[model samples]
Target: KHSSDICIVGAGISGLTCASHLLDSPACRGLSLRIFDMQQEAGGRIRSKMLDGKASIELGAGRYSPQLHPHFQSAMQHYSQKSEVYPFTQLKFKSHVQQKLKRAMNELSPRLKEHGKESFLQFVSRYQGHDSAVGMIRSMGYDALFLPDISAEMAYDIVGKHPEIQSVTDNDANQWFAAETGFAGLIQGIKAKVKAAGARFSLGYRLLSVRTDGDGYLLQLAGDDGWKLEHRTRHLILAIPPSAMAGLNVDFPEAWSGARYGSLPLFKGFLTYGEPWWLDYKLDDQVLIVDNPLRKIYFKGDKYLFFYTDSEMANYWRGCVAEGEDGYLEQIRTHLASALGIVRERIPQPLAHVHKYWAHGVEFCRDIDHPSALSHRDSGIIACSDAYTEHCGWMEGGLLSAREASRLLLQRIAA
Candidate 1:
């Protein structure tokens, strides 16, 4: 039996933060910590690719607002990363219909109680007294987003709190930021800091099973290299999503929640060019939303451009890639030309490109709110994730959730 004072699964930001915090604090200075994740790499959703040792393009959680993400802001200050304002905040596409529905959403933020499982579409349709209230979402090229799986509050969470399309009830516009060297570099700095503090890491080790022991838990992990082992720890922390947590041999959200959890697929595609061809239209550092498969397209300063999509469109683009890169590039180029109202010849061939698809890119609760950090009913094992935080699906949520998990685990370990 493997032995450690603490074992944390899912080496994403949460588990890493938990380990580093525990190992560094004078409260639990003597604890031995070990962290593991499914991927051979350490970073989870905070993925970034450095192109030719120059430009940085993100495939995962990219922009974070310093004002809203104070925890992440503190980390950035500690690490001292160079950054610039993320220049895509306001929406440029809207009819009078979208504005009215948005007004209703703002007014009806706290006046909904669902007992019979209603969808966001139905709720809007019922209150807004229109069949096309979902057009508010579909107008922006996202199909099937207001489905029955999403509750009224869930829809509010998706739109009312989203950085790009939040309600106008909030204060004046705030600035969002992107790192100069990419967030992957920041992840490396955190990992190195944790390593120097005597924390051990095990990559490619996925948790398979878990069971309660005398005072803690026994975990079974399968390695990518065809090796399996059982680890015993006095305390365990699961920093994975609800999907992964449900798959384990533990009763997740047993007492933690009565609401079901939901996950969304995310896709991002980046296209490079020989020159900044988009400058002909003076469209640098701007975002354009369309009714095409590309959905939301963003332009970086002088490097390249990328498009982000979620829900059904994410799957559609993933299919575009599997069909062929030729088809994929053709789709992106065609959408670019059509959305910009420019001729096909105006757009040049891409010098190179990179893309990624995540099956469960973001997670959230379907019915009600979730705890910041939850412990097992009887075993004292705790589970936490960004899915449970207010800023779900962003790096800020990851930092906040990690801080809460670390704080709770530290108190328990000391007690």
Candidate 2:
């Protein structure tokens, strides 16, 4: 039997952050905190794979707007300082390249919040706008970052706040960054601190269900050995995505379970080459936001180039093999050459390639004012995840939600 004063489900950033804070707090000196995740590793969507056994290549949750996102800024300050980070080199705006995008945003911006429950496509038409989807997909870095089927309300909410069409363009608007050591460094750093503070982690444990057990809650979990175990805790913090929650086969409040959350499908292709051949473009940074099948590209280290695709495009590439007939790498090279305006022969073939897909890539809330998708159905049970926060698709949201949830959990335990 497993028991604790506080039980946190999903050892992603939210859960890890919550555990770290609670463990360090004086108010929760004697509290027994336990964290669990289904994956063998932590960090959730923030993942990185090593290249040549030295350099880190991010496969998920790569960059952050240091100037705009305070939550990420705070995390960088409070967490480990050893994470080598640098600003993305600014690139000049290509107005001619995305003329269609500008026209769409120009038409849609004036009519912001003027439409109701129509699809984004329909709303674009209502505003006499065409190519707005492409504009949004290209400018907002939504190509493989957000869902193409997003509602007009959600679309307006995002565009109205940040209308800029490109993520890595210009010095004023697109000041983003990356970590050289890998996001895993950040995750492991937090895990180290949490462990030092005496928080127990049950990694590789899949939560099966949560039910009321008198004054507390009983949790059913499956261990790595395939054995089912029961846990009793006074307070439960579910820091998992909606898809994960649905898979748990547990009964939650109807209102909570029925709440609709928006998400996107994403796929990333990382290719390692013999050399950095794309440096000849004279682009300020290695970041490229192009109008192609491979929408977003990031140059990692000297030889690794990363490609990201979202929505329908991601689904299209999910089943294909990387080599041989109808291979992804060849298509990737062709797309890269086309985006760069270079011949196929100019693009170098990669020594190795990796592809990853996330069916529920990012969870975005339509109502920005009510960002937390979390539903507090009962006192002992609570929901928390990046999916529950307004800053979806960013680590800031997860960190903020973690702080909020931890604060509440701490208050409950003290009472």
Candidate 3:
């Protein structure tokens, strides 16, 4: 049995941010801190893989445009070297169109406040006086826009804020970039700072249960190597997602929240070719929005390309991968050729490819009836994640939620 002044479960960006903030606060001096994670390492959703130590391929939360993501921008400027990324509008399309949805998306924020829970498709349909208003938007790579649960506000928020999908409703003020190499630099930098501040890290441990204790709580965790421990805490933070919280089988925000939560399954597939043959088509750091299974094909500068999809399209591709890689590559080559208006033979088989699927890649809280960081009715424990913020699926949301969580905890401790 061990004890601490604070125990933050889950060493993702949310937890790291909270830990850093708490440690930096003068009121938290000499407060023992311990961080736990299920994985052997940290750096949650901002997943990136380096190929041969040069080309960076993002398996999760990729690029960011500074205009909409101030916190993420500040972090990047302070922690990592950023690489430039071009807008998808630079990609020459075989075919495209414009619609009333653009005007609606342009005026989304103000309209969002007065709108009800109608799906974006319904709102657009009603506004344009046509049931087919969302067809162009969906065809041009944002299939999630038509999701039954995607309220008009949520839909606008996604299109208006996402770095890759900005072309759908272009503000014409774009400067997108990602960390040089990957998120490794950013996470490593923060962890270095946090570690120097004397916070403890308990890796490869999964929280099994939590129970009330005297003036605090008891957290039981099982390690990956078959060890268990019970720790008593004066303050606790569960920085994991809503799904994980629900899995804990404990009353969480459910006990004190009116905000409904949901997650969307997401898939990303990357292809590395023997040559950057797509460049012959004049595609350089550009993206194509097609109606094919490859919803949004992003062309990285001379190294590789990837397609990202969500909702039904995401699930369909997931099934294809399950069938086997050989069959999957065949589909990719076929789509790659068709999307580029080239013959199938011209598109060579990829040298190597990688793919990833997250069952809850995009987590979001539809409403907020409590503090940004959810607090317990009568306990020192608090919970928060990007899912609770407007930037839900991106790193920016993670920072916002963590900032609020740190503030909430500091307020409680100060009093």
Candidate 4:
């Protein structure tokens, strides 16, 4: 068995960030660090696939809303190329509904100012008295916020706290943005920096079990090729999803394992073509919010358009495996065509495409008692993930949580 001062499980952004921070800290002057991940590559939810060695297609954690995420902004500054902002736009019907919502929220500004502990849906229903407005807001806001299913209190708090998401009355807020090189760029850049800082990475290994030993813990890891490795460590940092813990069977603290954090069910289907056919139909707004199964259609410049849906709508496409004529692929194409007010023939057959279902796309701090990253750490074990941070769904959450986990572990080591 190999031994190290620290062994980090799951080489996602959280783990990588923690390892980087720890390696740079005075608390880790001579400590050895090893990082492991299940996937052949790192980055976790922040992934991008390059097309024919050219264009990049984001498969996960595609964008960042920086107005609410200062840590994310600071992290980006670590790299040279700054990411460009992508603004959200609505369809005609959505615009009409939002106008009504704007009026209602404007009139109820007094109540909103008080910060009530009610669900956003409930608050809108009580104040607006319009199902249309409620449904429109939920459909548009939920997926955009990466919260497949969320409560009003949390939603209210997020919007109220963030200037970017506030009512249209405040138009000065800068909202959404994406990396020019895709989120994968940020991951690659950070991974390189972490490696330079003297961290060892063992990719393509899954943590099978973690058992406490005399002065530390034993981590059993399994690789895809049927080899197992055991490593002993004085400290262990787990920067993984909460839902993933049940399968690993580790003796994690109840504060980390038992917390009722929720995960978003999301589906992203991309279609690429030789040319931008959607532009021919004069739908140049670049973003579409519709009432159809294709709840959100994002036009990421030329030849690449993706449909995003969550909750019930996403589940409908998640289980389907049919392909070819009139199958799942056809259905997606048909849905997009219909939403764009064009026939199937008008939409060119994609040269190449990809579909993904992120079972745990985003994590939510739904309840008042949800465990924080600090609460989840005890003794030699530290839990770090977007799920444990206040930012939850965004990459900013994972990075911030890793910073906190590093500080907590350093404090423990000192004690």
Best-performing candidate as measured by TM-score: 3
- lDDT at 76, model 3: 79
Runs in model 4 deviating more than 4 A are 87-95, 112-116, 128-130, 138-149, 157-172, 250-258, 322-326, 367-372, 375-379
Candidate with the larger TM-score of 1 and 2: 1
What TM-score, to 2 decimals, does candidate 1 have?
0.90
lDDT of 3 by residue, 1-415 (tens): 4788888998889999999889989998888999988888788877778865547777887777777778888887787556565455454553544333445556655665777378777677755555456565665476777777777766666765655545556555666776666776788888889999999888899999998878888988999888988888888899999889877646755674756678888999988877788788888678777878898898888888889998888898899999998898899888988887878999878777789888888887763454557876766568878877767777777888889998988887876
TM-score of every candidate = 0.90, 0.86, 0.92, 0.88
- Which ten residues in a row are the worst by lDDT in model 3? 94-103
Local distance difference test, each candidate = 0.76, 0.69, 0.78, 0.71
Candidate 4 local lDDT, 149-261, one digit each (tens): 45554655554443323544443355667777777788788889888888888889999888888788888999999799898998888888877765765544364555455
The alpha-carbon RMSD values of the candidates against the true structure, listed in the order shown, are 2.9, 3.5, 2.5, 3.3
Q: What's the number of clashes in each of the models?
A: 0, 3, 0, 3
Decreasing TM-score order of the candidates: 3, 1, 4, 2
- Maximum-lDDT candidate: 3
- Give lDDT: candidate 2, residue 223: 86
Name the lDDT value of residue 141 in candidate 4. Answer: 40
- Ranking under lDDT, best-scoring first? 3, 1, 4, 2
Q: In model 4, what are the clashing residue pairs, if there are any?
A: 119-152, 119-153, 120-152
Positional deviation of residue 99's Cα in model 4 after best superposition, in angstroms: 2.5
